[PDB]
Amino acid sequence: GINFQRLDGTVPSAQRRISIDHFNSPDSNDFVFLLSTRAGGLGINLMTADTVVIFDSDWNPQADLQAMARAHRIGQKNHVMV
DNA sequence: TATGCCCAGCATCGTTAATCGATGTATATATCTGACACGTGCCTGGAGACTAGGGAGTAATCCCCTTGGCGGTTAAAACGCGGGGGACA
């Protein structure tokens, strides 16, 4: 029972856009959001988010460094956690 | 003289026994052919023995090619609906 949405490599521009905003709005319930390495770090920014967790290194140095870049941006007012 | 009576006389039927011949069944012998093994004779195409050499084995290095992963469009596969025309009787 935890409210979420997924962020894959398979989604229409219109549908991708709807949720990204739904998420950074002031009063959004879902604190769980799952993303891709190339599809996740693709672009965008997450300003509400503080914690980011890595299952496995992304066969390379730095795909992760941007992967955290989407969440760790100028706005975030809640430190950061990785 | 004709008509019933005595004394032979071969063919009718059936039954017994000996005989020539056909059929069925052994039983040891004399052909028929078809060999497979051996020794006869000879050739050399293989075996046996030795050499020499170059192919192929292996090992050590290289670098090209094949597989992989990924993501964007953009055609293609997929589906269905509908009804016509070919299959099949």
From Swiss-Prot:
Q: What happens when the gene is disrupted?
A: Decreased sensitivity to the cytotoxic effects of 6-azauracil.
Protein's cellular compartments: Nucleus
Spell out the family assignment given in the record's similarity comment: Belongs to the SNF2/RAD54 helicase family.
Q: What is known of its domains?
A: The 2 chromodomains are involved in the binding to the histone H3 methyllysine at position 4 (H3K4me3).
Quote additional remarks: Present with 1620 molecules/cell in log phase SD medium.
Q: How does it assemble?
A: Component of the 1.8 MDa SAGA complex, which consists of at least of TRA1, CHD1, SPT7, TAF5, ADA3, SGF73, SPT20/ADA5, SPT8, TAF12, TAF6, HFI1/ADA1, UBP8, GCN5, ADA2, SPT3, SGF29, TAF10, TAF9, SGF11 and SUS1. TAF5, TAF6, TAF9, TAF19, TAF12 and ADA1 seem to be present in 2 copies. SAGA is built of 5 distinct domains with specialized functions. Domain I (containing TRA1) probably represents the activator interaction surface.
Describe the task this protein carries out.
ATP-dependent chromatin-remodeling factor which functions as substrate recognition component of the transcription regulatory histone acetylation (HAT) complexes SAGA and SLIK. It recognizes H3K4me. SAGA is involved in RNA polymerase II-dependent transcriptional regulation of approximately 10% of yeast genes. At the promoters, SAGA is required for recruitment of the basal transcription machinery.
Q: What's the protein here called?
A: Chromo domain-containing protein 1
Lineage of producing organism: Eukaryota, Fungi, Dikarya, Ascomycota, Saccharomycotina
Gene designation: CHD1
- State which stretch of the full-length protein is shown: 735 to 816 of 1468
